[PDB]
From a paper:
In this study, we report the crystal structure of P. aeruginosa CupB2.
The unit cell contains two CupB2 polypeptide chains per asymmetric unit, which were refined independently. Size exclusion chromatography of CupB2 is in agreement with a monomeric protein in solution. Hence, unlike the PapD and Caf1M chaperones, there is no self-capping relationship among CupB2 molecules. The N- and C-terminal domains are connected by a kinked linker, residues 145–152. The relative orientation of these two domains are stabilized mainly by polar interactions involving the side-chains of Glu111, Arg145, Tyr183 and the main-chains of Arg110, Pro146, Lue149, Lys150, Ser151, Pro182 and Tyr184. As shown in Figure 3 where CupB2 is superimposed with the structure of the PapD:PapH complex, Arg36 and Lys141, together with the F1–G1 loop, are all in immediate contact with the pilus subunit. Only the biotinylated CupB1 peptide, but not the CupB6 peptide, can pull down the CupB2 chaperone. Consistent with the limited trypsin digestion described above, the CupB1 peptide showed no binding toward the CupB2(R36A) mutant, strongly implying that CupB2 is indeed the periplasmic chaperone for CupB1.
Residue numbers in the entry: 31 to 124, 134 to 165, 174 to 216, 223 to 247
Write the structure that this text describes.
């Protein structure tokens, strides 16, 4: 269901499409909606500047539907990505299953996402910290401390533009981390700890 692991929404566009596949042998209804990180309130009341058409869709057995995401020109930061969430709920019966994808609104002048993961700087607090001095979210599939080949896994996550993230778990450590690109692929980086 969806391929698709994230949506990049470039400021120059009025809309972007997305495929959702029904891999099973029965029709399912797919409901789609966007929120701004709050999942605990009726979506309409958040007035996020995105709509998803159609909001509810039948998806054929071994088939796929196309969802359409449209931006309503609204004041969002101009110097950094904004983060929204696409939800897809399968009401497939009938119980039902719910998916949640990152949506990155990306201002036009931001052309260097591919360089971002490599400008992160790292340091110990005990407990380690990454500083993201860039305009882009950086999503980690894995972060690891390494000492003479010994791997100590500290978790995955995401660091927001112009922010710091802390990872918790000595010594001559290096950090190795993998990040998810715009297309769901992964790239890796090693760095020393400050």
């Amino acid at each position: 269901i969806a391929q698709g692991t994230r949506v990049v929404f470039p400021a120059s566009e009025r809309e972007v499409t997305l495929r959702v596949s029904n891999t099973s042998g029965t029709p399912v209804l797919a409901q789609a909606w966007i929120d701004d990180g709050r999942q605990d309130v009726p979506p309409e009341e958040l007035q996020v500047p995105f709509s998803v058409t159609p909001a509810v869709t039948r998806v054929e057995p071994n088939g796929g539907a196309v969802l359409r995401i449209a931006y309503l020109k609204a004041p969002l930061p101009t110097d950094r990505e904004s983060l929204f969430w696409l939800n897809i709920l399968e009401v497939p019966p009938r119980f039902s299953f719910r998916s949640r994808f990152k949506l990155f609104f990306r201002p036009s002048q931001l052309k260097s996402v591919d360089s971002a993961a490599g400008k992160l700087q790292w340091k110990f607090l005990e407990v380690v910290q990454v500083n993201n001095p860039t305009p882009y979210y950086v999503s980690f599939a894995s972060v690891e401390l390494i000492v003479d080949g010994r791997v100590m896994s500290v978790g995955k996550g995401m660091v927001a533009p112009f922010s710091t993230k802390e990872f918790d778990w000595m010594e001559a450590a290096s950090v190795r981390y993998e990040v998810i690109n715009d297309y769901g692929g992964r790239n890796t980086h090693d760095r020393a700890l400050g």
